[PDB]
Amino acid sequence: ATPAGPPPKNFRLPPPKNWDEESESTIDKVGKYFLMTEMLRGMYVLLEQFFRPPYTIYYPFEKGPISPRFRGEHALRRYPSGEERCIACKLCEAVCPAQAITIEAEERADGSRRTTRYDIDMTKCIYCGFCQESCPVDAIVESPNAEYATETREELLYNKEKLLANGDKWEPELAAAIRADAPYR
Amino acid sequence: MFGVLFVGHPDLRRIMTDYGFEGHPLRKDFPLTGYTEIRYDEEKKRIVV
Amino acid sequence: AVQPTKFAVTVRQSRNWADAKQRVIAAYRAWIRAAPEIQTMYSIPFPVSHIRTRIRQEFERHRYVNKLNVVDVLLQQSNADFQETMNFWRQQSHVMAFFKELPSNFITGFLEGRN
Amino acid sequence: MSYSQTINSLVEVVLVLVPSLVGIAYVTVGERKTMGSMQRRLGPNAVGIYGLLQAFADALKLLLKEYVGPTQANLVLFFLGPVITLIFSLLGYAVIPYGPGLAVNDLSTGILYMLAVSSLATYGILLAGWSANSKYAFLGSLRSTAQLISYELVLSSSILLVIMLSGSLSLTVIVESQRAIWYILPLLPVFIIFFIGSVAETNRAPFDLAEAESELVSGFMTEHAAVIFVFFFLAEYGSIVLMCILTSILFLGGYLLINAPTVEGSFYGLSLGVKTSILIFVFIWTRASFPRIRFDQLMSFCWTVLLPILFALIVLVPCILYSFNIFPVNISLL
Amino acid sequence: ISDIHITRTGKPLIRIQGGRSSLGEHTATVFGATGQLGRYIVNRLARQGCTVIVPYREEMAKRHLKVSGDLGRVIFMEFDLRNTQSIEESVRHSDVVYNLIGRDYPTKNFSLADVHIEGTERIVEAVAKYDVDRFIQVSTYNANPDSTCEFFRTKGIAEKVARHVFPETTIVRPAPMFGFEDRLLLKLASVTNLFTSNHMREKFWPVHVNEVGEALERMLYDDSTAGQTFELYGPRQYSMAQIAELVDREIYKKRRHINLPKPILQPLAELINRVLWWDTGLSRDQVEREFHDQVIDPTAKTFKDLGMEPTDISKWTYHYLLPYRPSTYYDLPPSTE
Amino acid sequence: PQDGFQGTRLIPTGADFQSPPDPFIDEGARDNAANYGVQKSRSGVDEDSVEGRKVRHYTVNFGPQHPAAHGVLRLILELNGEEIVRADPHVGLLHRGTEKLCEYKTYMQALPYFDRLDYVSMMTNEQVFSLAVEKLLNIEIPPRAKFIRTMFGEITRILNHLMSVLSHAMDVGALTPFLWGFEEREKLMEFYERVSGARLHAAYVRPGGVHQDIPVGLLDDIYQWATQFGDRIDETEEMLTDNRIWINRLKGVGVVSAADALNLSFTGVMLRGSGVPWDVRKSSPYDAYDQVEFDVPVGINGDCYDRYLCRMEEFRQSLRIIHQCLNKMPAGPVRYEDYKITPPPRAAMKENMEALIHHFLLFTKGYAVPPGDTYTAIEAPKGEMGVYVVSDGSERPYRVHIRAPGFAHLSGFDHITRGHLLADAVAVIGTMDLVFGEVDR
Amino acid sequence: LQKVEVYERIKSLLAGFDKVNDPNNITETAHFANDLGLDSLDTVEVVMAIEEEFSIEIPDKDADQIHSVDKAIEYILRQPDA
Amino acid sequence: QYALTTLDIITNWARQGSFWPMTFGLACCAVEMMHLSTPRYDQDRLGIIFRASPRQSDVMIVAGTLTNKMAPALRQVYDQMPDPRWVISMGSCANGGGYYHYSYSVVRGCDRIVPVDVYVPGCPPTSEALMYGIFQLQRKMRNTKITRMWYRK
Ligand SMILES: NC(=O)C1=CN([C@@H]2O[C@H](COP(=O)(O)OP(=O)(O)OC[C@H]3O[C@@H](n4cnc5c(N)ncnc54)[C@H](OP(=O)(O)O)[C@@H]3O)[C@@H](O)[C@H]2O)C=CC1
Ligand SMILES: *P(=O)(O)OCC(C)(C)[C@H](O)C(=O)NCCC(=O)NCCSC(=O)CCCCCCCCCCCCC
Ligand code: SF4
Ligand code: SF4
Ligand code: SF4
């Protein structure tokens, strides 16, 4: 048990106190017993909570606070010209810890290295952000969006058509989050 | 997990795996996803393997 | 320490082949004695004859073992499978997963795809 | 009389049952909104304006929810127990004076009537729990039986100390007697003890052992769904209010104030309700303040603390009465 | 049975066999699949990786079916019989169409003639319109256009309409069915079924619903079953009295019935069906079937023609009636008397 | 191996080396009140080995679908009336093969798994895995990372204790303290969601430091929260410490002696409740702990009440440590300055060749960990949390084994609970502070 | 019990067993293995069947001793249940 | 049609206003689930109280990983939940197995076991994301045709 070496000073407890050694008055001890004193204090503490402002917010009219680093649903992003930023390096497919990303690429009609397939199984994803961490060109990002609950699981299998549409819709926040969070990356 | 007997052990039985489970999943030759999977069956009205 | 459960048996090695011989008979007896009790615990709709048939076949697959250290692993597994069954830790789906209610020729296998 | 006997009886029962069943619905919302305030929450504020339609959605949802009759359950008894508990809990409102004699039955023995009706309704809990033939409901019912072996003597002992002062056993006479002083002043220990027993009598927290959710899943009502569950909830919350009314009848002067008949009769009704509503708050405040007691400890608390003190008062109190020449006349007067 | 199926239109289907992740290659549409039979055909098709369109009416009652198959396998379409478009939208991607739509009793918007004749008419006319390979319509036993029972007559005329429009129809005539959630064994163990016109002495060859779903699965694979007519009945003949005897032996309850004279009961039964919204088991025609007896029409293929041997209802009483045993007799073994 | 085929020498067993006690000084047949006639075989006539295998005690499945089960435990209880004669906890209902899945991941890819073991103590679980890999990497993480990891280590400790202590009070029947303390934890998950992007599974603490640096307003907001958290501890102190129903539900309950608590593999409060002074942050200082002052709460009776008093003291000691970390936060990097181990800044990866090659290799291959094995242990909020990592010299671990405090604690459940009532079992589940992500792994 | 009574039921059971070589070989002094052609597991089933019919429990020590019909008869008389 | 809609309105309003989920939870998604019962979101302010028994429950939220050892128990308590009943799948593990999808002991999505009415994304979904999925389910109740369904048959 205790450390080797000299035993801790005063580690041995003092000898037990007898009933007639407890220095509490009978009037106090009996009063506390019969008057339920300590539990009246607890009742009172609830009373002053009753007259304190509540903590509650009125979701969805009010929303709790989220940061620029918040990790929500995925979106594929474009350059200011409308060209896709994704170049099919496959780094995010490799680093994924849950194997939720499946990518197929080719040379495009104009000789460009672009994806032909881009799927995220949103029921396999763990929402860690490792895929946006690894992107060389800021293509895959996680939006600040958390409200995208669906009726079926097929609605959670995102193809490139769904992910580009997400970036096309959410670009103003995705840009404002990257702006606010880039220097720390 | 590995299948090592401990002679003298009182109450040596499975502690981690499913009840009818067969195999030792931390063995290297045990495949990552195993051999079986379960589903609820509509015709039999139970979980089947 | 914590109490071993109702059918918990201490893990011990077989002294000789006579020891193993007597233990295997004890385990087979204890299983077929319990088949009526398994049927009503797990609401088996088959008769107890089928349940005892399956117990016999499980023992028969280890019939031709001539190694004490393989038998004792096997006597371990049956002890845990017996204890697991009698204390009702497993459920009906597990017990029915145990009852199954490959192509018989090359040509049959070939024509359907492999099997 | 001026109109029919049956019509007078009809509208009087309605004026008692209907406002009480409305009052029961609001105690359930009020408890949820009161604890939330103590819990820095809001409570129901979206089922109706300010959440004032929440109990009705809960009630309506359950009467449209599927009932299940378990295969292992004794089914006639599985339905009989909640029906007994509800009917016999609501019967206790038939002797409440909402004014001098303003009761559905101004019985000469309305205190014994309340003890008989409460005891009979707890037997439904025992029966329904046993009938389910499931472990947790079985363990729930056994706790409810232990609990009545704990609080019934305590209430009966406590009330007998009030009857020594009143001399009547009629609910109006006891209230009329308190025009001299409220019985919470001379009988202050009895008021605390009777209130403690009433919390145990209602299976309210810290004595929610029969239906404890952290020890049993729902105790006696675990197999009960839809209307059967709703029968047990109306019985419990109707029992809370009734015990708060009775505590106000016996210690707080009842209806005593703290067209012309209508204006006066209203003041009695408000005064009883205000004192009842304060005691209803004390219940909810009590559920929010304390941990659950252990059922062994509740039995020992009633049987080695409460009853020994109540038996000594039963000796002491009449000795003070004979000594000061204050035994009440037991004739009809007030 | 093989890894290659070739259909009547001649398209090939290269299959990978096992599991819900594999390729069954068949796109089926099962009308009337939210009933009692419909799940067994849907589970059989779905768990072998086939796409199944499930035309439904009430959303919450279709939900147990999705569990049968993998993602994207079971497709729900919301339809009505009198909505031809929704019928046509549901069968036009398909290589087999199962018609399991029927109702024992008339409703305020469907007579037995309207749900059987006209419903089959629209379904078969869409099968013809989009050239679907196979059409397995399920009729009833004793179906006859010359019958006088509305059930046995109207399901007998839809049989002829289907053949007249799509001659390759596999017509399937099951006997009264037993199984889990069956309206055979569960009614005899119930307490509502107290009224009766005969003395429960009508006879039939009851058939397991599980073996009928299997039979419908095998008709899809045995292409030669097209254009045929199948009566799917059990191994023995029983009366309602013999079946009810088995139920009492199993649940240990000894149920009882109140017999009524048919000129008296039948008018009442037509009132209960017209004044209550739920399936009451009682109606004028269901009383008329109650007095009728099952005849296995020859020249009709059987279970043996699928290479299947049905099992007797007695072997299944313990499995399906055990929920109805009283606690005292519940822990007992199956009767096997 | 081959010799085992036929009969050979029997492998020696603990029964063989048993020794007879000396009769001159032996006093008593039971020096422990745990086995003092509060177990099985204290009633009936015959033992349950022969002629007793045909009968059962009243056996109830306490969980999994149970509130006091707090999740996914199947605790099979044998009741003699309302008394526990035997407790058999059945676990593995949240066993998901984490330790096998880690073998098909790079070391980075396995770190989010540790977020999900004790899933109220994410950043502490991350730390024990980050300290084992850093030891096998033979690297020294910078001072700012060590102070961030100790500060968020104690923010995590407070978060766990809020869930642990107030879930435990909820089981005993006290509802209101749970609600108050969950606003404070709701406050503290902002600090998580501001440095990482997650309220719960941060993936923040990683081998080599932390993923990103704290944002420029975070230290001031942590200090603002710190100036009021003392009042929060006192008002929950105000409903339970002196409550006579709280005292009689926990005092004398779940009693384990000091010498048995060590023999049961107990750690943390389960050990310190029994009077042993032992803290892993005091005995093997890790991160910045040896740079701060804190006290170690130690009980004397080894019961649920002392364990409650030790945990309510750790609220005050964690808040004391947090203040010193805010004061002593140094400048500098938050990642070890080696791009062969930690990812380079995105600026550098887009600007320079050796930064791009290193970014590419760290996210595809991973970094290689020099071969060897290690046991690394930290003072987790639930006890000694440890990891045994075996290294191939490659980029994937050969073996990752997690030593979970609650696995060692739930095993001693029948030892301390047999003889108490059904409510006392509820009391002991909450004092023993179980999360079955770590128990099952 | 009666010796002839506790033997007549055994012959019906033993003949009722599926795969004895021939029902004639059952005598009062017949051996399961040498005569009736029953291996280890078949013999354990036969003692199990005998115990179920007589509604008695045959313990492990004396269960092994029953390798012949006569030994079953003597044990049945020795154990006081029927 | 007017009266049969009005019954549907009053029926669905009750199902919405009294929304009682089972107090059942498997892992860390339950942490975010119990944060809906705490003061910031105060799930009771909308009429949502967690009932322990499946007999008094309307909705089962699968908040956690479904292992093969638990699947019989999840299915058993779902069957024991009375009609009308709903299932919310919360989290990647209950959706499709999540981070443990390639494990030997994990059901790859709870909808291999029970039917599922709404799927919430995230690991963990934020407290508000779960509230958004409960708002989807109540919006589905509010459009559920009960009495007008019978009137079509
Ligand atoms: N079960 C038996 O004993 C026997 C059955 N049969 C026939 O077998 C078939 C399947 O039997 P079973 O599953 O037990 O029958 P059910 O009555 O249980 O199912 C009938 C199906 O038909 C659908 N349906 C009925 N009327 C209509 C309508 N007007 N419009 C659209 N859909 C409609 C129902 O959909 P919904 O649920 O939405 O109403 C349901 O899915 C039926 O055709 C039946 O007549 C014949 C002989 C014996
Ligand atoms: P006779 O001299 O012929 O003796 C026969 C035996 C079998 C003893 C052999 O001669 C022998 O010695 N062979 C080697 C031992 C052997 O057969 N096996 C080792 C025994 S362990 C074993 O076989 C375990 C089998 C599986 C588990 C038990 C069976 C029951 C499983 C579950 C039943 C249903 C549950 C729902
Ligand atoms: S890492 Fe980014 S750029 Fe590279 S393939 Fe993936 S999404 Fe495209
Ligand atoms: S955030 Fe999702 S998609 Fe990206 S790496 Fe992690 S699990 Fe994969
Ligand atoms: S989805 Fe994520 S948070 Fe939820 S149980 Fe699974 S790993 Fe934990």
Side-chain angles (χ1 to χ4, degrees), chain A residues 28-56:
Chain A
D28 287 330
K29 191 189 196 290
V30 160
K32 272 152 101 194
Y33 179 79
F34 277 118
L35 295 158
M36 293 176 70
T37 300
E38 73 297 327
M39 272 153 36
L40 302 151
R41 188 156 167 139
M43 297 210 54
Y44 198 89
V45 174
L46 271 178
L47 267 180
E48 61 92 23
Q49 308 276 23
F50 182 90
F51 290 110
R52 279 166 176 196
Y55 288 118
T56 310

Side-chain angles (χ1 to χ4, degrees), chain E residues 216-232:
Chain E
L216 302 162
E217 183 178 1
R218 299 291 180 90
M219 302 150 165
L220 172 66
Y221 305 154
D222 175 354
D223 63 303
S224 180
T225 50
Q228 295 297 109
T229 300
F230 282 83
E231 264 192 327
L232 279 298

Side-chain angles (χ1 to χ4, degrees), chain G residues 4 6 9 19 22 25 30-31 35 37-39 48-50 54 56 61-63 65 67-68 70 77 79-80:
Chain G
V4 59
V6 303
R9 43 190 61 189
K19 67 181 178 67
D22 186 74
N25 317 104
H31 296 269
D35 291 331
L38 320 175
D39 201 352
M48 187 50 53
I50 288 315
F54 290 93
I56 77 171
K61 185 176 298 298
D62 54 50
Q65 309 295 136
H67 67 269
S68 42
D70 43 21
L77 261 318
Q79 210 271 350

Side-chain angles (χ1 to χ4, degrees), chain A residues 42-43 45-50 55, chain D residues 34-41 284-291, chain F residues 162 165-167 169-183 232 235-236 238-240 243, chain H residues 37-39:
Chain A
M43 297 210 54
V45 174
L46 271 178
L47 267 180
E48 61 92 23
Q49 308 276 23
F50 182 90
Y55 288 118
Chain D
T34 300
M35 293 178 98
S37 304
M38 311 204 159
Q39 288 171 6
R40 314 293 304 266
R41 311 190 280 118
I284 300 151
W285 193 11
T286 286
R287 185 179 68 189
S289 312
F290 309 112
Chain F
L162 285 180
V165 168
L166 314 179
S167 296
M170 197 169 71
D171 299 329
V172 189
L175 274 293
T176 186
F178 185 91
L179 279 298
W180 304 341
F182 262 67
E183 201 44 33
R232 305 287 81 68
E235 275 144 2
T236 176
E238 198 81 61
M239 319 291 300
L240 301 169
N243 189 296
Chain H
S37 84
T38 61

Side-chain angles (χ1 to χ4, degrees), chain A residues 68-69 138 174-185, chain F residues 212-213 335 344-348 350:
Chain A
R69 316 195 174 170
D138 286 24
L174 301 177
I178 290 149
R179 182 192 64 220
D181 190 359
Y184 297 90
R185 301 185 196 273
Chain F
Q212 286 181 264
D213 190 17
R335 285 154 299 186
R346 290 189 74 90
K350 288 170 189 214

Side-chain angles (χ1 to χ4, degrees), chain F residues 118-172:
Chain F
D118 173 6
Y119 51 67
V120 292
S121 310
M122 284 68 77
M123 269 195 203
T124 289
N125 305 151
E126 292 168 76
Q127 207 185 11
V128 75
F129 190 54
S130 308
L131 278 152
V133 183
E134 286 151 9
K135 210 183 177 169
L136 293 164
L137 282 175
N138 200 51
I139 57 154
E140 179 87 49
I141 63 158
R144 188 177 170 99
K146 273 189 199 165
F147 262 105
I148 291 175
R149 290 154 58 137
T150 177
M151 176 186 62
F152 268 109
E154 298 305 311
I155 288 157
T156 302
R157 183 178 329 270
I158 284 161
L159 267 167
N160 168 87
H161 280 48
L162 285 180
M163 166 86 55
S164 304
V165 168
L166 314 179
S167 296
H168 168 61
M170 197 169 71
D171 299 329
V172 189

